[PDB]
């Protein structure tokens, strides 16, 4: 039947968040709290349009907002964050429990400088 409509490569090129999984997991809780609105909007789009070719722009905003989130960390809490993710990186399962001391350090600075409050359980 019809020709599959596919977006051009140019319109799907976005600056990628080139961090490791351990780095993402260390800042995962804060990332969700800070970037909640853009992430939730994109999820709603993909869960209503049900087509990746309709929510490409929303995906871009998520990446851009994610980059801004890490940009603030670098300019305010660079050293404590490095300690946190490095500890998580070592653990094969990337367990949070093994790095609770480092987490407290990163949470404390981020609470003081950036004012971010880590989301609680559930």
């Amino acid at each position: 039947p019809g020709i599959v409509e596919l977006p051009t490569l140019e319109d799907l090129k976005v600056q990628e968040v080139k961090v490791s999984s351990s780095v993402l997991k260390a800042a995962a809780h804060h990332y969700g709290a800070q970037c909640d609105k853009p992430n939730k909007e994109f999820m709603l789009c993909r869960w209503e349009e049900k087509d990746p070719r309709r929510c490409l722009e929303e995906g871009k905003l998520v990446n851009q907002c994610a980059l801004d989130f890490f940009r603030q960390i670098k300019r305010h809490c660079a050293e404590p964050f490095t300690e946190y993710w490095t500890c998580i990186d070592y653990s094969g399962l990337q367990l949070f429990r093994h790095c609770r001391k480092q987490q407290a350090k990163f949470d404390e600075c981020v609470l003081d400088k950036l004012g971010w409050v880590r989301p609680d359980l559930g």
């Binding site: 990628e16 968040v17 080139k18 049900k50």
Partner: protein
């Protein structure tokens, strides 16, 4: 003699597993959930005789999702033409298809 005691007593004993579009544990979607949903919704109460012809398109697409026979045929044709071109030296697989260019995250 399908004594539909299930519907008479309003008890589900095996209807949960009849289709893959039914509720699955932890809301894990089926591979062809959308196609099966479309086919079932099309052929609801219109009768098997009418469903066989009227909802033919839905079932055809559903079967294509289930077995991917036509998709496999198309991909095989593409592969055959590509290999023929390679043998004649009329095609060069691009570096990203060769893996030279790093993938996107």
């Amino acid at each position: 003699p399908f004594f539909d005691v299930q519907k008479r007593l309003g008890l589900d004993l095996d209807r949960w597993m009849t289709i893959q579009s039914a509720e699955q544990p932890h809301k894990i979607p089926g591979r062809c959930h959308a196609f099966e949903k479309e086919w079932i919704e099309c052929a609801h109460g219109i009768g098997g005789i009418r469903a066989e012809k009227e909802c033919k398109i839905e079932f055809d697409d559903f079967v294509e999702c289930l077995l991917r026979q036509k998709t496999m045929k198309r991909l095989s044709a593409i592969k055959r033409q590509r290999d023929k071109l390679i043998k004649e030296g009329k095609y060069t697989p691009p570096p990203h298809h060769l893996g030279k260019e790093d993938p996107r995250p």
